[PDB]
Design a protein around this ligand. Structure first.
Ligand SMILES: [Ca+2]
Ligand SMILES: [Ca+2]
Ligand SMILES: [Ca+2]
Ligand SMILES: [Ca+2]
Ligand SMILES: [Ca+2]
Ligand SMILES: [Ca+2]
Length: 153
C-alpha cells in the first residue's frame, strides 16, 4: 500500500484512502471515495476520481521546474466542484502576476489544459509551477486552491 522510493503506479479502491507516492515518478489513482493524495518528490500524475479529493505537497520541492528539467506535478481531469489543491509549502509572494514568485493561471489554446506558473527566483532560480491536464476549466472555481476567498472584482 502507498508507494516507495523509485517509480510507482498506484491504484486506489472504492473506499476513501490516504495514498502517498514517495520519491520518484509516480501515477496515483484514487477511484471512488474521498481520497488524500500526496505526490512526494519527483514529478507525478494524480487522478482523484469520484468523491472530494485533496492533492497535497509532501516536500517543499514537490513540484518545481528548472532548466535541468521539469519536476512539477500534473493533476488529471479534476472536479472543481469538490476537489482541493494545497501548495503552501512552496510559497508564493503574490497571486496575480506570474513572475518573480507571484502566481498566475494560464490555459492551453483549446482550454483543455490549465497551468499555474510563477517564474520564482527568490534565491535559487527554481520556479515552482504546476499543471492540470483534462481540467474542467469550464467550471473552475477559486475554492479549489488553499488561499481561497478570491472574490471577482
Ligand atoms: Ca515512488
Ligand atoms: Ca479511493
Ligand atoms: Ca513522487
Ligand atoms: Ca476519489
Ligand atoms: Ca474528485
Ligand atoms: Ca511531486
Amino acid at each position: 500500500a502507498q508507494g516507495t522510493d523509485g517509480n510507482d503506479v498506484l491504484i486506489g479502491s472504492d473506499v476513501g484512502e490516504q495514498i502517498s507516492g514517495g520519491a520518484g515518478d509516480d501515477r496515483l489513482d484514487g477511484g471512488a471515495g474521498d481520497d488524500l493524495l500526496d505526490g512526494g518528490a519527483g514529478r507525478d500524475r494524480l487522478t482523484g476520481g469520484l468523491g472530494a479529493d485533496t492533492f497535497r505537497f509532501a516536500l517543499r520541492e514537490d513540484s518545481h521546474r528548472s532548466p535541468l528539467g521539469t519536476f512539477s506535478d500534473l493533476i488529471l481531469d479534476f472536479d472543481p466542484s469538490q476537489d482541493k489543491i494545497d501548495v503552501s509549502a512552496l510559497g508564493f509572494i503574490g497571486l496575480g502576476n506570474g513572475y518573480a514568485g507571484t502566481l498566475a493561471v494560464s490555459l492551453s489554446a483549446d482550454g483543455l489544459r490549465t497551468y499555474l506558473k510563477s517564474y520564482d527566483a527568490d534565491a535559487q532560480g527554481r520556479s515552482f509551477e504546476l499543471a492540470l491536464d483534462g481540467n474542467h476549466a469550464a467550471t473552475l472555481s477559486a475554492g479549489n486552491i488553499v488561499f481561497a476567498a478570491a472574490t471577482p472584482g
